[PDB]
Design a binder for these strands. Structure first.
Lengths: 120, 67, 66
DNA sequence: CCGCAACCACAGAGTTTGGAAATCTT
DNA sequence: GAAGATTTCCAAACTCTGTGGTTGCG
């Protein structure tokens, strides 16, 4: 789905919802794109950071590069981000040498994810 | 327990839910085969007109090329 | 009796068979989906090939003229 | 007080998995 | 008919959202 520039000018990645429910599947498929040239089969990993949580547990945080893209299957966020705080994840392309990219204040992980205001 | 009133009811609804799903998947599968024919028809159709535009442009080029 | 040696063997035998067969089912299911994408690929590729030649003929027509 | 944003639990619809029977096909 | 294959039935184990009870904190 629509993509966005990263901290790095060599890689683009999928846009993410502002806030989503921990351990729930995302609206789109998370994918990383390399503008330069990168060897298919290049392992790519995603970590999620935050002041509060140093690194939050994730599911399907690894993916093999293919045709300049490393599509991720049902990537998932286990750890939470803390009220009002967002996760700043770290994409890490495993080439020679390993390359790094960052998407700042990317997604928010709460136990409920977006909910409908309570009718009280 | 296996004779609870809750039991049977919960159980009997799950059953309905299952019928639903089985039906659903069985259906998607079919729609897929359909989706495959659909395209096979298109590749055949595409393939025919492709061998056409190749003969027609290879013919026009023939009068031209050899004069 | 749903618990008489004979039945029991016959039962297990069938199970052995439903397992094998469910398996085949899924496999065939995947092949299809695969086949699908594999077409869509070829289908898209052919559409170009047409475009390519359609233009190419519009050129040897506008060319025969001039 | 109230409503928002987070947590926790925890119903209830969906799904996937697997052994029985029925139904088929050979 | 007989044997194996396929399908239909369900039960059980989980997975996928939702909603309700609470709570600090504007």
């Amino acid at each position: 789905g629509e993509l966005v520039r990263t901290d790095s000018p060599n890689f683009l990645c999928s846009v993410l919802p502002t806030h989503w429910r921990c351990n729930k599947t995302l609206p789109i498929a998370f994918k990383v794109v390399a503008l330069g040239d990168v060897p298919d089969g290049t392992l790519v990993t995603v970590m999620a950071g935050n002041d509060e949580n140093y690194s939050a547990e994730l599911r399907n945080a690894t993916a093999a590069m293919k045709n300049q893209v490393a599509r991720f299957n049902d990537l998932r966020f286990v750890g939470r981000s803390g009220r009002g705080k967002s996760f700043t994840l770290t994409i890490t392309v495993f080439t020679n040498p390993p390359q790094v990219a960052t998407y700042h204040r990317a997604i928010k992980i709460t136990v409920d994810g977006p909910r409908e205001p309570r009718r009280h | 327990d296996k004779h609870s009133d809750e039991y049977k009811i919960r159980r009997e609804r799950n059953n309905i839910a299952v019928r639903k799903s089985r039906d659903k998947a069985k259906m998607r599968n079919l729609e897929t085969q359909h989706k495959v024919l659909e395209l096979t028809a298109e590749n055949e159709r595409l393939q025919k007109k492709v061998e056409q535009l190749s003969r027609e442009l290879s013919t026009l080029r023939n009068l031209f090329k050899q004069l």
